[PDB]
Design a protein around this ligand. Structure first.
Ligand SMILES: Nc1ncnc2c1ncn2[C@@H]1O[C@H](COP(=O)(O)O)[C@@H](OP(=O)(O)O)[C@H]1O
Ligand SMILES: Nc1ncnc2c1ncn2[C@@H]1O[C@H](COP(=O)(O)O)[C@@H](OP(=O)(O)O)[C@H]1O
Ligand SMILES: Oc1c(Cl)cc(-c2cc(Cl)c(O)c(Cl)c2)cc1Cl
Ligand SMILES: Oc1c(Cl)cc(-c2cc(Cl)c(O)c(Cl)c2)cc1Cl
Lengths: 290, 285
């Protein structure tokens, strides 16, 4: 197992990362942003795809047709993603006409300097740690490039130690929470989108300086609902071959709820996790709902 | 598959039972008890072996050498198992009888002769875990399915010997009588000395520090786990594949926390309340 992780991951700037990405990190380091670039940042499996489609719809005034012109991972390039010449986020962005929407899972400390220098707006989305752990576990099982996660308890231990891609979820959300105090960095919660999607959609429309009409909001709401996105080949990653994403084992649009952790954490693992969580987050005003 | 699951079982008087036992059930119901017979009754996986060895040691005044003259399932016949009835019929008194039968199904002869009975119960969650591994390792059992699936079966009493809830509630009522000693696995775990002394007095034996000392040492989990007379290792893998899961598995209280998800635990507790809130019987998980 530890050997598996050693083969699959490597650190960059002290953060564990997919080895393929690290090989060409210089391209990420020197990435050139544009003033109107919009960054969507998240710790893995926090609802990136969901908010990305909401944002894309807002950019297209809710035109569903314009949102299916290409798959989501081509419409919204994954900044640091690189797999030799098979996948290249920086290349996709470089050739992309503005306004560009950039997806990234990088903690603030690793975001390319250009983005800060150009004062680009950023939307950060987070989700409670327990549900993120469950979602990430299945991701490890379905997606190529990951070591065997082993049992759920084993995987959760590594999660608690930040020994997974992008490092510590705890440090990730806390660092972005600080950046979120800024007006140009909108800090959102997955659970808030679940509880009152209308409120969050209207919040996003205003953040992006667009006009919130009843018709636009309505289109966004049903189009970005879990069931619709799960069936939408543009947003469900099903165009990817099984060797890349084996959705037969687990679909990308898995369950889309808050609280699935209760179906995976044993009572003992939950007790241990909560204790560790409290130590990690006690000194923070950031509060999540499970 | 439900079909494959129940193919291994057959109901007898309302409770699911190992098909082989049922074939000879008339012999069980017609069993002839003796006045000095001692019955050790338990729902499966509640510590039967543990309390059986404690009782045997008391009968043998703590003579460890005597407790190893034969394997436990021969020293203390499993009444309804088949050949328990034969072993008992051919055994000299005083006889110690092991059984997992609810009080309503205990052979009439035992009640008619007013035999002493020791009943041992354990919290439902830990019993479910212990029983789950028993299914995986013991022949005669179908695939228990996933743990959540097995727990569902357990809650519905769709396992050998039926409803744990009805089993413990009925025996609790019988336990009100001074003739039926009602014990808890958790009590043996928390203060074995207290329970051993209680057992010695119940069995009208003279307690001594030596006797108590010997029993406590001899009946510890580690000792019994390594003792071939009590760990069921003499049975071939075909009968009991302990490579999959040993009979003497963990011997603790609370292992349920390592198996029940938060969701399953919540569902189980809700169901538990509906089944037990009217009983004065109180546990500890
Ligand atoms: N429209 C939507 N509504 C709710 N959850 C959604 C969603 N689109 C994606 N998700 C969930 O977001 C997670 C994927 O996150 P990301 O896009 O950051 O990789 C998955 O969580 P689950 O695995 O818990 O179902 C997925 O089901
Ligand atoms: N001396 C001892 N101390 C504690 N637990 C014991 C024990 N001997 C057996 N057990 C436990 O009693 C259970 C078997 O019960 P029975 O004899 O009725 O079939 C097993 O529980 P676990 O599976 O939880 O470990 C087993 O480990
Ligand atoms: O959000 C994502 C994260 Cl964190 C990682 C990958 C991802 C997918 C494949 Cl197939 C890989 O080989 C690697 Cl190294 C990363 C994809 C997405 Cl969409
Ligand atoms: O306590 C026990 C219970 Cl409930 C069942 C068996 C048991 C063991 C085997 Cl190998 C079988 O084929 C059957 Cl049908 C029951 C053994 C013990 Cl010791």
């Amino acid at each position: 197992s530890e050997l598996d992780y050693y083969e699959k991951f490597e650190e960059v700037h002290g953060i564990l990362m997919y080895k393929d990405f690290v090989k060409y990190w210089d391209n990420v380091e020197a990435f050139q942003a544009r003033p109107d670039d919009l960054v969507i940042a998240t710790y893995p499996k926090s609802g990136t795809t969901w908010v990305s489609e909401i944002v894309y719809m807002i950019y297209k005034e809710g035109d569903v047709e314009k949102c299916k012109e290409d798959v989501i991972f081509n419409r919204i390039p994954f900044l640091e993603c690189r797999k030799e010449n098979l996948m290249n986020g920086v290349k996709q962005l470089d050739e992309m006409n503005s306004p560009r929407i950039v997806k990234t899972h990088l903690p603030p400390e690793l975001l390319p300097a250009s983005f800060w220098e150009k004062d680009c707006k950023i939307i950060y989305l987070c989700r409670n740690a327990k549900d993120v752990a469950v979602s990430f576990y299945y991701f490890f099982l379905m997606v190529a490039g990951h070591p065997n996660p082993g049992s759920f308890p084993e995987f959760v231990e590594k999660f608690m130690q930040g020994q997974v891609p992008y490092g510590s979820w705890y440090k990730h959300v806390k660092s972005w929470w600080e950046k979120g105090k800024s007006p140009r960095v909108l800090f959102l919660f997955y659970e808030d989108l679940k509880e009152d999607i209308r409120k969050e959609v209207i919040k996003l429309i205003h953040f992006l300086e667009r006009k919130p009409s009843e018709e636009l909001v309505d289109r966004i709401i049903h189009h970005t609902s879990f069931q619709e996105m799960k069936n939408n080949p543009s947003t469900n990653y099903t165009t990817l071959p099984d060797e890349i994403m084996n959705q037969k084992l687990s679909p990308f649009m898995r369950k889309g709820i808050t609280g699935d952790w209760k179906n995976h954490f044993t009572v003992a693992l939950n007790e241990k996790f909560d204790k560790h969580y409290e130590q990690q987050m006690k000194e923070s005003t950031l509060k999540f709902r499970t």
